[PDB]
């Protein structure tokens, strides 16, 4: 019968909150109730990139603090130089509706995806010195909304089919599938050892999964609406999350709980992107309303605000050494913050 | 004084400019256009009707989950781009966004079948009050007249039942009835663009709006209604900036 | 956690009321846009009532228009929908749904198969 089993699955969501309530005894703001404040911080846009026709969707730094590929509406994959704004690639891309972006940890490879429900990867470095698609994975039953390059061999691909994949370059298989959300999934984001990633969906819920074994490990709740960002502490025992409630959240794993909600009454639009800072002190976050927010994850008092776009703020991302921001908005500019 | 690497990137980023420029004229040469409606309301016939007019060349191949999918046609040297999209999920809350910068949201819609059409109705609702969509202006393509045309002539419809207003109902004035066009027939016909443009008229302002088209099933001139409704979108556009309108 | 439960379905003659209530709970429920759908047998879900965050907005499908009424209580997080002089094709399971965003008037994908934030539904029958 399927009373019964819903009678189950209540008891069981009643024990699992009994479960949490038995370690709350003080909440994050107590224990945190003596740290002197971060401060306000004002960040000037050092430089500014030019040369996208349409709004960009994504980006990723690369995996030396000085490279950047951008994805745009417009159907390039623009490869800059933050150092001095140069463009070094302006690969075009097959479809112009892509939301996603990636670099491989190497500076190799560079990948994206779109509507198309397909994941080119394009090789950077060949014998000619010219880009390519080397592989092109399909499979997905829906639009692809994240990929992230686990390693040269093997990348993460989230979708809208309410699935996650992790695929195989050299052959294009889809190895491990990871199942168990029932909504859009949006963002993904690896933890700092290329074992373990967490996946934010459209049911207002997040997720970690085991990359090798492909099975849930745990589930978070707490988020009212859709998911539409999430990043990685990068002792990687934390992500933070950003959803259409207007309210960017912490969550941990091994208390399986929600630690903070950053939120204000003069904030109404969701969060766009999420991306936490070296020392996992500044929690720079995108907003709707054309700004972007420097949070902080113990204080979670609103410090700084780096406002400079006219548009929708839809990609950020903190780079490895820490000594910058960039910020791409629907406005078709790219912006280094520092 | 550094030259070697510094001058090597100066060169590779004006080539790459110069591309970019190129490109620009191209991508802002040509209208895109979000097909949107159901199964029921012969978008496929649609988009094969206005695909007439445009090693190997064939790409039947394409992908077995395909995606979006693209139909390039061409009126009068303008080459608009229009994105059927195909095999996705039900819900479209969240890849809707990406349709935000597009000349026209062509809508279609079936007006002979009466139990449907209160769907149609609660979807162009929701695609008129959405925030990324709100200065994006919707063609309406009303298909399936003919069928709409053999329903009322031959009885077994009662539209009053599905709508309790066809009763308390009159025919605009400004009705263009076709030759050989019953009243009933017209009444109906234009029964269904009112209730349409309830819900265009209602909000909206005045920064995007709604073009009824009759569209029977193969008309040619499809394609036609889209270029007109096109330009007369863009001349809007630029005689807002002027604030002349 | 956003959940919704529904209440007050079962058998009734034609002609006759019925009150539905629908609890919900891990949202703010006055920010919210709340919706009534109902699945018929052997067809799809199709939308019947919608009301606003303030309940000022107030909208009806036309099979039950004039007979159904639907109210929210901001306070008591609760949604109800009167329904007055039943007919045999009324019979449906009736979810109450939510429009996905807070602040907004488009309520998308509530009528979507497999949309989340939607109760799991009470049979009613006629």
């Known amino acids: 019968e399927l009373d019964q089993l819903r009678q189950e699955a209540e008891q069981l969501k009643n024990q699992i909150r009994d479960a949490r309530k038995a370690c709350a005894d003080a909440t994050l703001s107590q224990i945190t109730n003596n740290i002197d404040p971060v401060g306000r911080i004002q960040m000037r846009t050092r430089r500014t990139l030019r040369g996208h026709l349409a709004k960009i969707y994504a980006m990723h730094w690369g995996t030396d603090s000085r490279l950047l590929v951008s994805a745009s509406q417009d159907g390039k994959l623009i490869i800059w130089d933050s150092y001095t704004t140069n463009k070094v690639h302006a690969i075009p891309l097959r479809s112009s509706w892509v939301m996603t972006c990636a670099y491989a940890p190497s500076g190799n490879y560079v990948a994206c995806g779109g509507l198309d429900n397909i994941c080119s990867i394009y090789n950077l470095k060949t014998r000619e010195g010219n880009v390519r698609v080397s592989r092109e994975l399909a499979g997905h039953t829906g639009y692809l909304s994240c990929c992230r390059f686990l390693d040269d061999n093997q990348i993460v691909t989230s979708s809208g089919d309410t699935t996650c994949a992790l695929w195989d370059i050299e052959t294009g298989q889809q190895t491990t599938t990871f199942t168990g959300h029932t909504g859009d999934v949006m963002s993904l984001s690896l933890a700092p050892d290329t074992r373990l990633f967490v996946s934010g969906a459209c049911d207002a819920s997040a997720k970690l999964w085991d990359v090798r074994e492909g099975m849930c490990r745990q589930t978070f709740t707490g988020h009212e609406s859709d998911i539409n960002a999430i990043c990685f502490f990068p002792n990687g025992n934390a992500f933070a999350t950003g959803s259409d409630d207007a309210t960017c959240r912490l969550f941990d794993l091994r208390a399986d709980q929600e630690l903070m909600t950053y939120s204000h009454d003069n904030i109404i639009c969701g969060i766009t992107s999420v991306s936490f800072s070296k020392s996992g002190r500044l929690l720079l976050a995108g907003y709707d309303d054309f700004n972007c927010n420097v949070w902080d994850a113990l204080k979670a008092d609103r410090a700084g605000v780096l406002a400079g776009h006219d548009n929708r703020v839809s990609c950020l991302g903190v780079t490895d050494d820490g000594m910058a921001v960039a910020t791409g908005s629907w406005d078709s500019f790219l912006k280094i913050w520092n | 004084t550094l030259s070697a690497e510094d001058k090597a990137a100066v060169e590779r980023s004006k080539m790459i400019e110069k591309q970019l420029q190129k490109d620009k004229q191209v991508y802002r040469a040509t209208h895109r256009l979000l097909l949107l409606g159901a199964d029921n309301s012969g978008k496929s016939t649609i988009v094969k009707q206005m695909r007439i007019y445009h090693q190997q060349d064939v790409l039947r191949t394409r992908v077995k989950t395909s995606g979006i999918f693209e139909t390039k046609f061409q009126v009068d040297k303008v080459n608009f781009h229009m994105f059927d999209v195909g095999a996705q999920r039900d819900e479209r809350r969240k890849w809707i966004q990406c349709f935000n910068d597009v000349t026209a949201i062509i809508f279609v819609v079936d007006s002979s079948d009466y139990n449907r059409l209160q769907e149609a109705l609660n979807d162009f609702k929701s695609i008129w009050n959405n925030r990324w969509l709100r200065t994006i202006s919707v063609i309406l393509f009303l298909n399936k007249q003919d069928l709409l045309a053999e329903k009322v002539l031959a009885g077994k419809s009662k539209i009053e039942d599905y709508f309790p207003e066809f009763a308390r109902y009159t025919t605009p004035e400004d009705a263009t009835p076709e030759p050989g066009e019953d009243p009933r027939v017209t009444r109906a016909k234009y029964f269904i663009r009112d209730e349409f443009l309830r819900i265009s008229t209602a909000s909206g302002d005045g920064r995007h709006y709604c073009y009824p088209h009759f569209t029977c099933s193969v008309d040619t001139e499809n394609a036609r209604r889209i270029f007109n409704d096109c330009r007369d979108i863009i001349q809007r556009m630029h005689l807002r900036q002027y604030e002349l309108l | 956690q956003v959940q919704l439960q529904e209440s007050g379905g079962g058998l009734v003659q034609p002609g006759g009321s019925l009150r539905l209530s629908c609890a919900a709970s891990?949202?703010?429920?006055?920010?919210?846009?709340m919706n009534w759908v109902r699945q018929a047998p052997g067809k799809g879900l199709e939308w019947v009532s919608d009301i606003s965050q303030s309940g000022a907005s107030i909208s009806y499908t036309g099979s039950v228009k004039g007979r159904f009424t639907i109210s929210r209580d901001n306070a008591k997080n609760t949604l109800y929908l009167q329904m007055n002089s039943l007919k045999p094709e009324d019979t449906a399971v009736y979810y109450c749904?939510?429009?996905?965003?807070?602040?907004?008037?488009?309520?998308?994908?509530?009528?979507?198969?497999?949309?989340?934030?939607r109760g799991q539904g009470t049979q009613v029958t006629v």
């Open positions: 891990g949202f703010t429920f006055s920010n919210y846009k």
């Open positions: 749904a939510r429009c996905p965003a807070p602040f907004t008037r488009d309520c998308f994908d509530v009528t979507s198969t497999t949309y989340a934030y």
